[model samples]
Target: SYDTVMDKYWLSQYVIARETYDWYTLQKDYETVGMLSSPSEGQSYASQFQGDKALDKQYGSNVRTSVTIVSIVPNGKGIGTVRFAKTTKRTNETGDGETTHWIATIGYQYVNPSLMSESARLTNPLGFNVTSYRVDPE
Candidate 1:
């Protein structure tokens, strides 16, 4: 029983890490990155950066952002809570706002026998299904 829980916890962590990395990578290169037509069904996480062109336009071409995973823990029922640290810095900007850091926690849920294809299910066991996320600054 405990082993299964641990397995789910670790698997979910991998899923979150992969998803966050993919999302932020797109953000870092938003100007030229391809956009996803839509988030898969059952995906309900924040769309803060999904299709926000304002980020590139407002920040200009000299912006830097990084995301790091701090920890992952089980929230029961096949859900994992992932904690991450993010840093955003604007180049050539002259203000205390030039650099900012944030700590964010997102919930990753594992779907068993999703309505999507078997290949999709095999490839993505976890989906971004949390309605709300918790983010705090340092």
Candidate 2:
């Protein structure tokens, strides 16, 4: 089961990374960003990050952000965990851009793959769907 979920987990992380970063693209659309995440886990993200609205005000939506997955492994029980590395570039009102680096750990739980969208399931070739996940400060 872990073997079957490995590559698929990586693929989902890419999707998660992109969607999570896109929240800063001025849309504040993070609702579905964690669609793969379990409800409780997604709520925790809202609690921690406070979602795109707060992030926009704090970091300024004018920033460009990118995510890099450093590593991933199956911890156990159909749960694949990963560490995400991120770099954010922001331009100040004075026209100078600043960069910041950060890292976080994300845990994804395996569920019924059939429940996932056809595109997501087919594209990532996942045998198990994400049931729950958490992103915590590193």
Candidate 3:
């Protein structure tokens, strides 16, 4: 259940799924993050983004974000730091690019295969679930 290498790989993809989104693709990206997260984490992530009644605001902004994962440093004990470069560009902003470095420190653990739901089995096949997740500008 705890294969270090597999966990590392999953986190890399998590960072990608969490950050690479455009207005058109953002809905699915949000769902993907929900699928990978633990119950509480997923609930929080959904609550923050699901005020979608203002689709006009989002579509009018016409923004896109992409994350390029730089590294994931593991310290064992279900902890790791993910470092990445996040780029944001808005079509309405003269095509200027804004890129920044960020660090996400995550506390995670494995779930028993049978304990996960069928949706989880399809999306997060390795059973890695994030318990405490945080990200900040670096």
Candidate 4:
């Protein structure tokens, strides 16, 4: 059973990697010569609205969820040079002093589904599976 679960998780993570790479290639297949978005854009992660709302709706109004920026890497082959500060918020309010969320990925051609799922999960989007893990930036 342990082996099976391990294999299953590994396989799925692998699938996630491959499918993610395919999506990256299809969606982000760009040359370094004329790259539009920067690496910092793609390396961001945010909270899942689903989780946020689920907690709020199920528990009460007083709910707090945290998001953290784990690491950052360039799209193709660059290390973390310009590490953006960890931007957060109670909501996507502009008055919060120019906070950045997963939306920051729009500029980057390689916005991962995880980021989308995270945004949805944080926003509690309708009709979608949500993930607990996120890749918040630094």
Candidate 5:
């Protein structure tokens, strides 16, 4: 059932699911950089340090990547971030060669049962966590 759904469309857009331990990742997206600390992420928008190498060693393989035109500026920052996780139907290796790209099938559900109600969806149903699931990029 869950697998069936995931086998089709995209995954969560809330940015939280991609941050938590719900998905899997193969390669790294240098563009989807955003952190709570200074210097910011993806400011330069280079692929030099984007991989499952030494940098991501501490936080594991889940990384959230995002981009904005501001990020491309010499000193501007992006407006938003792209949080993501990678999971596959096959074996999870470090991938092969430099083409560490992803072809994913995403699936999701509303954690709140009350979300079915218009009122519940419009109003804040409960206190939710905004923690981003990440490992430092290498």
Candidate 6:
């Protein structure tokens, strides 16, 4: 029960990392998600933010995004059904707060740090990995 609660909390943070960012913090934001993802799912989410970062740098649109969790329910074992709201705003634009609703289906697993190298343990001591992540607009 406690582990499940912690899983929900970690999943919320992971969702925020995946969905919230700006040109300034895009790299750190996406990298957070990428590092926590399983190998098969890493690349797909890893580079997902670069294009946005590139365009923002080129266009100089200063935008920031934030996420708020609406609810998190268990859909299956190690799987979370998440609903959240995201607001994106432009720094220069007046009254540009727009919030969108979405849902993310997340599957995760916790690994044994004893199985990993020292450096790996240093970075991911808990070895919590996201195996599946899917998001859709609500």
Report lDDT (CA) for all predictions: 0.43, 0.52, 0.77, 0.28, 0.28, 0.80
- Candidate 2, 1-138: lDDT as tens digits: 756466445545534543355434433335444554556665755564565666655665556566666666565655555666555556434443333333333445446677667877754344433445545666
| Clash number by candidate, in order | 0, 0, 0, 11, 7, 0
Worst 10 residues of 5 by lDDT: 67-76
Q: Per-prediction TM-score, please? A: 0.48, 0.56, 0.82, 0.19, 0.19, 0.82
Preferred candidate (lDDT higher): 3 or 4: 3
- Model 5 C-alpha lDDT per residue in residues 1-138, reported as the tens digit of each score: 554332121223223323322124423222122221113222322223356653345335443332111111111121222333333221244543231222222122224435346654342233121222222332
Say which prediction, candidate 2 or candidate 3, comes out ahead on TM-score: 3
The residue ranges of model 4 lying beyond 4 angstroms of the native Cα positions read: 1-53, 77-138
Worst 10 residues of 1 by lDDT: 29-38
**Cα lDDT of model 3 by residue, 2-118, tens digit:** 566777798897778776757777777777887778889888766655577543355544777778889888677888899999888777777658889999998888778787788
Off by over 4 Å in 5: 1-99, 110-112, 115-138
Candidate 1 per-residue C-alpha lDDT over 1-138 given as tens digits, one digit per residue, 9 for 90 to 100: 774565445444443333332333544333211111124322332244446554434455466555556665655654445555555555457543333444444443434446667665443443323323455665
Candidate order, lDDT descending: 6, 3, 2, 1, 5, 4
As a whole number from 0 to 100, the lDDT of residue 30 in candidate 3 is: 78
Per-residue CA lDDT of model 4 for 1-138, tens digit only, reads: 553343333223222321121212322322211122233322222111145453234423222222223223333221221222333333423434334433111111222445446544443222222111233343
RMSD in Å for model 1 = 6.6
| TM-score comparison, 2 vs 6, better candidate | 6
Which of the two, 3 or 6, has more lDDT? 6
Q: How large is the C-alpha RMSD of every model relative to the true structure?
A: 6.6, 4.8, 2.9, 17.4, 16.5, 2.6
After aligning candidate 2 to the native by TM-score, how far in Å is the CA of 33 from where it should be? 3.5
Give the per-residue Cα lDDT of candidate 5 at 30: 26
